[PDB]
Curated annotation (Swiss-Prot), chain A:
Name this polypeptide is given: Small ribosomal subunit protein uS5m
GO molecular function, one term: structural constituent of ribosome
Complex and partners: Component of the mitochondrial ribosome small subunit (28S) which comprises a 12S rRNA and about 30 distinct proteins.
Assigned protein family: Belongs to the universal ribosomal protein uS5 family.
Stretch of the intact protein here: 217 to 432 of 432
Keyword flag Ribosomal protein: yes
From Swiss-Prot, chain B:
MF-aspect GO terms: structural constituent of ribosome
Official protein name in the record: Small ribosomal subunit protein mS22
Primary location recorded for the protein, binned into one broad class: mitochondrion
Statement: the UniProt record of this protein carries the keyword Mitochondrion: yes
The organism's place on the tree of life at top rank: Eukaryota
Gene: Mrps22
Shown segment, full-protein numbering: 63 to 356 of 359
Presence of keyword Mitochondrion: yes
UniProt organism field: Mus musculus (Mouse)
Compartment(s): Mitochondrion
Consequence of gene loss (knockout): Heterozygous MRPS22 knockout mice are fertile and show no overt abnormalities. Homozygous MRPS22 knockout results in embryonic lethality.
Post-translational modification N6-acetyllysine, affected residues: K148
Subunit structure: Component of the mitochondrial ribosome small subunit (28S) which comprises a 12S rRNA and about 30 distinct proteins.
Keyword terms: Acetylation, Mitochondrion, Phosphoprotein, Ribonucleoprotein, Ribosomal protein
């Protein structure tokens, strides 16, 4: 597995009660693994020695490899919002060159997955396990453009502002192309996040927002 | 007298548009600029074809050719000669009327010289001050340095002719000598190196063919159009050459033989082609390939 890299995410050194020494020692280590090409996984390893916990977590994670779909190899296929227990994650698909503007743990995992450009915000509890589980839960349940074309039978067309009105066909239905236009409501019933909308409403952001940071 | 065809003549614009061509991928090639996340729409085959039609409508407006004009004539008019003010000033005054609703070519920009002469501002002085008070995005007050022959040659080595011309349209006026100089230098470089494909599906192809027709050097463009299987374009180019040069030996020969289609190109080769021998060879080879394969 020379093509895979391992990264640590949390290391807890806790003392437990057992008759050997009265209070025994234990190290719980959460790690992540990935080849930077879509395959990644995480595991928890426990031992009395930190070295043993590293080995147990590292080899367990290679058995739980998710495959994450990347749009054009650099970003997620669509915005993703989810709550795993009390940890809320809100990811956004971004254009090339945007970089990884995310929680430091999400940057670590995204490099292992191979995502190069994305935005994410984490709210609620910052529990590392819930953030890792919640991240993989959302990234592994995302809908590729080809899947959407097959489900609805219609063409999936892309419109970039740097390409003008040129329609770009990114996915065509595998079977029979439909002829019923997808219903276009006059006013959508989408549930909007105040945090996303607040910006476009002209409300001042925090002094901490969009600061100059090193390349991620 | 039969009017000499113009660049904007509806007949000339038709022929120049056809030979130029269209390519939605080249016309709408991605710009290297600040980016935004793409949008996505689910569309049927009818909706997609409608969207492609709008893209072709926009590509037409994008390919609108820039004006081809003759070189402006120097402005040398003296409004007054007040000699009482001789020696009372060391520097020229330049006065610009900045009333908003006046066309820039109808504004009064005068110069009071140290000698006392009140004269109209020259063309170079007019363009500089109009940029200072009515600044145009893309244009700079002082002429950029990229237009120097050494710098332009660098852009040609990188095959950036469409850029040299897009910059020449942002900076200089169509009737200025600098505008004509750069265009005629770019068009001449394309000819020598046979780089006609660089300006296809661009707004600059028409002016290039126009320049070659007027200068009686369409040989290279015909040889290249034939080798690319664009023989309908080559025929249209020979029609435009027989339209701007009606009394030419080639135009009179085509009337005598009522030549059409591929015949027109053969007539040009024998009569007025600078390199007729090659036009026939390429034309013959095209016919052989078309006939042999199909």
């Amino acid at each position: 597995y020379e093509d895979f890299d391992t990264r640590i995410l949390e290391v807890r050194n806790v003392f437990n009660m057992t008759a050997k020494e009265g209070r025994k020692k234990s190290v719980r280590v959460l790690v992540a693994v990935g080849n930077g090409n879509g395959a990644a996984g995480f595991a928890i390893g426990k031992a009395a020695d930190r070295g043993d916990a590293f080995r147990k977590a590292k080899n367990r994670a290679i058995h739980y490899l998710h495959y994450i779909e990347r749009y054009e190899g650099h970003t997620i296929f669509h915005d993703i919002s989810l709550r795993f227990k009390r940890t809320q994650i809100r990811m956004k698909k971004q254009p090339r060159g945007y970089g990884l503007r995310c929680h430091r743990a999400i940057i670590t995992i995204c490099r292992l997955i191979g995502i190069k450009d994305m935005y994410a915000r984490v709210t609620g509890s910052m529990n590392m396990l819930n953030l890792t589980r919640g991240l993989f839960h959302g990234l592994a349940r995302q809908e590729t453009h080809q899947h959407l074309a097959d489900k609805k039978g219609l063409h999936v067309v892309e419109f970039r502002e740097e390409c003008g009105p040129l329609p770009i066909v990114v996915a065509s239905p595998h079977g029979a192309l439909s002829k019923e236009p997808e219903p276009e409501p006059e006013v959508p019933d989408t549930k909007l996040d105040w945090q996303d909308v607040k910006a476009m409403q002209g409300l001042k952001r925090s002094v901490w927002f969009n600061l100059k940071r090193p390349a991620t | 007298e039969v009017k000499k065809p113009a660049f904007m003549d509806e007949e000339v614009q038709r022929i120049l548009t056809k030979i130029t061509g269209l390519d939605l991928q080249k016309t709408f090639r991605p710009a290297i600029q600040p980016l935004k996340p793409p949008t996505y729409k689910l569309m049927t085959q009818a909706q997609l074809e409608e969207a492609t039609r709008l893209a072709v409508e926009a590509a037409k407006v994008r390919l609108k050719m820039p004006p081809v004009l003759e070189e402006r004539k120097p402005i040398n008019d003296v409004l007054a000669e007040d000699k009482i003010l001789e020696g009372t000033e060391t520097n020229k005054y330049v006065f610009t009327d900045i009333s908003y609703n006046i066309p820039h070519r109808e504004r009064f920009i005068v110069v009071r010289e140290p000698s006392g002469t009140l004269r109209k501002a020259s063309w170079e002085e007019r363009d500089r001050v109009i940029q200072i008070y009515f600044p145009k995005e893309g244009r700079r007050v002082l002429p950029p340095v990229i237009f120097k022959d050494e710098n332009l040659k660098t852009m040609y080595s990188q095959d950036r002719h469409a850029d040299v011309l897009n910059l020449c349209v942002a900076q200089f006026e169509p009737d200025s000598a600098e505008y004509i100089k750069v265009h005629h230098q770019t068009y001449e470089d394309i000819d020598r190196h046979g780089k006609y494909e660089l300006l296809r599906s661009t707004r600059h192809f028409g002016g290039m063919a126009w320049y070659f027709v007027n200068k009686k050097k369409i040989d290279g463009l015909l040889i290249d159009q034939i080798q690319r299987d664009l023989v309908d374009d080559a025929t249209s180019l020979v029609q435009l050459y027989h339209m701007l040069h009606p009394d030419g030996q080639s135009a009179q020969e085509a009337k005598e033989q009522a030549a059409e289609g591929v015949d027109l190109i053969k007539v040009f080769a024998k009569t007025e082609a600078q390199r007729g021998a090659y036009i026939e060879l390429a034309l013959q080879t095209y016919q052989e390939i078309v006939t042999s394969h199909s």
